[PDB]
Design a protein around this ligand. Structure first.
Ligand code: ADP
Ligand code: MG
Ligand code: ZN
Length: 623
RNA sequence: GCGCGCGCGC
RNA sequence: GCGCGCGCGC
């Protein structure tokens, strides 16, 4: 483990070396190579290299609290006995941050803290650090805190404000190629990433690949394009029942066709789900009793279509049978009883169609073949099966557990047993199964295999693209590691210079409750807090919201979130944002996303306050 | 509250 | 830019 002595593997000594030579280096190695151990050695070498009377200072960035706590503990245990001072700062920690940094040798930060401390000038300069280590360093792009930090660095390095600058090291399992759709674009993307981190070296394992390849998941991948049914006669009944039920809806809500942005919805697809969502979440109520009821049936049909597509009709029908038993046993409406009657007409035709052997799903025999072959070769195979939807998980399970040909299988659903069906995972650990099947899923011990099983050309094309994107990546790195370093440094510098040139480049309005459209406040009543937070003055506003005190509060920078504020109109109770304590003031704080803006009385819906270009008046203590 | 990143769809 | 969501930070 990470808390115990380790002999470094040969390839770890191999990856540590550029860093140990003082080079700004991106260390790129697959998950589970031991990136914590490499960074431990690098850090160890960095602080020991200093002559007596001199002292390094290391900062290590973690992007998340759990990772932050893991390394704070690993680094502490590891540098016991050297006598180094070791602490961390995170949101939970909040403190003389300048002095915490000054009086410690190893600091673990989430990076936003350092961004906050640079901007405010509490930490005047990155020059206090002699080494900076970025975990998951591929995040150094695009406004990520890691980039903000590096913009500070680069502004110094390029403004000749000197000031020695810390060595910079990054760790990642994959440098990425971004949007790249060719080698040149891939080379460009990776070069841009090295520019952003001032990296002149990319370290990969070369001399010890066989030693590495002895402990990194790399299954032989397999594309298996298959053919669908010749004719889903089950879909043709369900689709009519679906057309029939949209009709009934369009009765009780005319112009249904307009509520969503999602256009040309097709039955039995992911979109149709999204359309149902972008409609169950609209209206704006005794009519959305009838509507939610109609859309919740169009959902059960949509689901069933998907089960039929990748599993057997029986599996889809059963999910429809089980559903219509629950509705009748719950109680009968004249709308819940109609749909159910509507269904009951076709029931005899569906049950007939379901059991017709020529209606069987050919993709399932293909799944069976795969599972057979392997379990013949390696009978001790433990498998993991990823499927498209939650209903499919149960469908496939049911199908395995009822199939004479797969009796050697013992299935389990997740989030002993010999094959595992699911939609996602953690933990998990795919490398700990010898067989992974992706059964029509948009995704990604030695002798392990991965199979991709689909009748969709699209789905095969996604994996081909992902794979090519990975090849372009490694090819690009191999090319770049051949450059003389001075030539690379010179390419990097001008990417950095260009980047930096770019960085260097009132009437009153109503705010209404999005749900019930009640007048909430006017804009000349709004005040800004710091620059990013919106509060509404006056006592009149206090009556127009209620609040529910959040028993678990969070201490943020500007203030403390103590309560959630909900709409005051009882038939609504809409989420409006929060109520805070800000410098002895009990003030409310609102998200514009909760509200509707009005000028001829024209409604406009904003997501981010940064869009609304109204007159922003800042807070005044006394008013 | 705000900020950051990802994925899908127009 | 718009829609839906998912993860995470202060
Ligand atoms: N030289 C080594 N000696 C013994 N165990 C190691 C060595 N290198 C890595 N490991 C093991 O492999 C695991 C991989 O963890 P970590 O180093 O965090 O992987 P990652 O490369 O994904 O960061 C470590 O927790 C450790 O238990
Ligand atoms: Mg790591
Ligand atoms: Zn309301």
């Amino acid at each position: 483990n990470l808390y115990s002595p380790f002999k470094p593997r040969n390839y770890q000594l191999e990856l540590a070396l550029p860093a140990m030579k003082g080079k700004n280096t991106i260390i790129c190695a697959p998950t589970g190579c031991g990136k914590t151990f490499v960074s431990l050695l690098i850090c160890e070498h960095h602080l020991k290299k200093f002559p007596q009377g001199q002292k390094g200072k290391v900062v290590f960035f973690a992007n998340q609290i759990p990772v932050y706590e893991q390394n704070k503990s690993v680094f502490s245990k590891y540098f016991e006995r050297h006598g180094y001072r070791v602490t961390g700062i995170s949101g939970a920690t909040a403190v003389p941050v300048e002095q915490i940094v000054e009086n410690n040798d190893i600091i673990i930060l989430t990076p936003q803290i350092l961004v906050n401390n640079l901007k405010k000038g509490t930490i005047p300069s990155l020059s206090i650090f002699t080494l900076m280590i970025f975990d998951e360093c591929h995040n150094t792009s695009k406004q990520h805190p890691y980039n903000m930090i590096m913009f500070n660095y680069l502004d110094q390095k390029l403004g000749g404000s000197s000031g020695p600058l810390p060595q910079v090291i990054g760790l990642t399992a994959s440098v990425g190629v971004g949007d790249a759709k060719n080698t040149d674009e891939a080379l460009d993307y990776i070069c841009k990433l090295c520019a952003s981190l001032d990296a002149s070296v990319i370290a990969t394992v070369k001399h010890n690949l066989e030693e590495l390849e002895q402990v990194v998941y790399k299954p032989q991948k397999f594309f298996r394009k298959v053919e669908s049914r010749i004719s889903d006669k089950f879909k043709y009944i369900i689709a009519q029942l679906m057309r029939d039920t949209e009709s009934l809806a369009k009765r009780i809500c005319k112009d249904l066709e307009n509520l969503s942005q999602s256009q040309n919805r097709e039955f039995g697809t992911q979109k149709y789900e999204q359309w149902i969502v972008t409609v169950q979440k609209a209206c704006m109520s005794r009519i959305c009793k009838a509507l939610f009821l109609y859309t919740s049936h169009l959902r059960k049909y949509n689901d069933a279509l998907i089960i039929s597509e990748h599993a057997r009709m029986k599996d889809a029908l059963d999910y429809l049978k089980d559903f219509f038993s629950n509705v009748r046993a719950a109680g009968f409406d004249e709308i819940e009883q109609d749909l159910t009657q509507r269904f009951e007409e076709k029931l005899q035709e569906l049950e007939s169609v379901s059991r017709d052997p020529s209606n069987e799903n050919p993709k399932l025999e293909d799944l069976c073949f795969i599972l057979q072959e392997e379990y013949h070769l390696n009978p001790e195979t433990i498998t993991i099966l990823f499927v498209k939807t939650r209903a499919l998980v149960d469908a496939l399970k049911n199908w395995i557990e009822g199939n004479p040909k797969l009796s050697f299988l013992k299935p389990g659903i997740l989030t002993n047993i010999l094959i595992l069906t699911s939609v996602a995972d953690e933990g998990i650990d795919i490398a700990q199964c010898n067989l992974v099947i992706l059964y029509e899923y948009v995704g990604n011990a030695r002798g392990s295999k991965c199979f991709l099983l689909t009748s969709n050309a699209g789905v095969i094309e996604k994996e081909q693209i992902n794979m090519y994107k990975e090849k372009m990546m490694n090819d690009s790195i191999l090319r770049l590691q051949t450059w003389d370093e001075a030539v690379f440094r010179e390419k990097i510098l001008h990417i950095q210079t260009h980047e930096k040139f770019i960085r260097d480049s009132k009437e009153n309005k109503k705010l209404l409750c999005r749900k019930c459209k009640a007048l909430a406040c006017y804009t000349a009543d709004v005040r800004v807090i710091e620059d990013c937070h919106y509060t509404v003055l006056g006592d009149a506003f206090k009556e127009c919201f209620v609040s529910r005190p959040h028993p678990k509060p969070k201490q943020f920078s500007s203030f403390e979130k103590r309560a959630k504020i909900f709409c005051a109109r009882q038939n609504c109770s809409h989420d409006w944002g929060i109520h805070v304590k800000y410098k002895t003031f009990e003030i409310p704080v609102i998200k514009i996303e909760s509200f509707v803006v009005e000028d001829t009385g024209v409604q406009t819906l904003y997501s981010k306050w940064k869009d609304f270009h109204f007159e922003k008046i800042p807070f005044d203590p006394a008013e």
